[PDB]
Amino acid sequence: MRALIIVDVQNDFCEGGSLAVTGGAALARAISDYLAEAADYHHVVATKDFHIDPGDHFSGTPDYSSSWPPHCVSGTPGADFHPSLDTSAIEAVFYKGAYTGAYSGFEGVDENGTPLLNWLRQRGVDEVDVVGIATDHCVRQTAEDAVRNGLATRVLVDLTAGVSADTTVAALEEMRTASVELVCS
Ligand SMILES: [Fe+2]
């Protein structure tokens, strides 16, 4: 009935990465050891940005709004899980963005055909907690898609890392107005 969804906790989104979010490395290890304390999840899954050829999504002259420097490229280290981050508990991985810019974990597919919402409902999951990077981008988008698709949804705000303070505030407010619950873990 309840699952935890770990969003985009990848090398390119941590310190050193092409799209470094300050606090990313620290956040990977805070999520491990949670997982070790509580817990209380019927299931645990992760999502990954994973680009083979997404076209205009990448640019040499990026605007950090619709075009980005190359990141999470298939066959490079940027695309892998940050090495903090116990992977033991993770039952399935959902990849999105192979040929396209992706905005939400709900665009991800696992290694057989399977889209995220399908995998969850087949297991009778009806409520989700969301954690990961970035609060103001893919976390926000994944949380509001969870609610659009009929799931009861929390974000564990202490277990997210956002890009900027001003945009993180705007994002937390839009999440409440969409009816996501914002709590500490
Ligand atoms: Fe991307």
Numbering used by the authors: 1 to 185
Quote the paper.
Pyrazinamide (PZA), which is an analogue of nicotinamide, is an important first-line drug used in the short-course treatment of tuberculosis. The structure of PncA is made of a six-stranded parallel beta-sheet with helices packed on either side to form an α/β single domain.
The crystal structure of PncA was determined to 2.2 Å resolution by molecular replacement using PhPncA as search model. The asymmetric unit contained a single protein molecule. The metal ion present in PncA was finally identified by ICP-MS analysis, showing that MtPncA contained iron at a concentration of 180 µM for a total protein concentration of 260 µM in the assay. A final refinement considering Fe2+ as the ion present in PncA showed that the iron atom was coordinated in a distorted tetragonal bipyramidal arrangement by (i) the side chains of residues His51, His71 and two water molecules, HOH220 and 221 in equatorial position, and (ii) the side chains of Asp49 and His57 in axial position. Thus, our results are rather in agreement with the previous report of Zhang et al. who found that the M. tuberculosis pyrazinamidase contains iron and manganese with a molar ratio 1∶1, as opposed to what was speculated from the study of the pyrazinamidase of P. horikoshii which hypothesized that the metal ion present in PncA is a zinc playing a direct catalytic role by promoting a hydroxyl ion involved in hydrolysis of the drug. This loop, which constitutes a flap closing the binding cavity, is locked by the third coordination bond established between His57 and Fe2+.
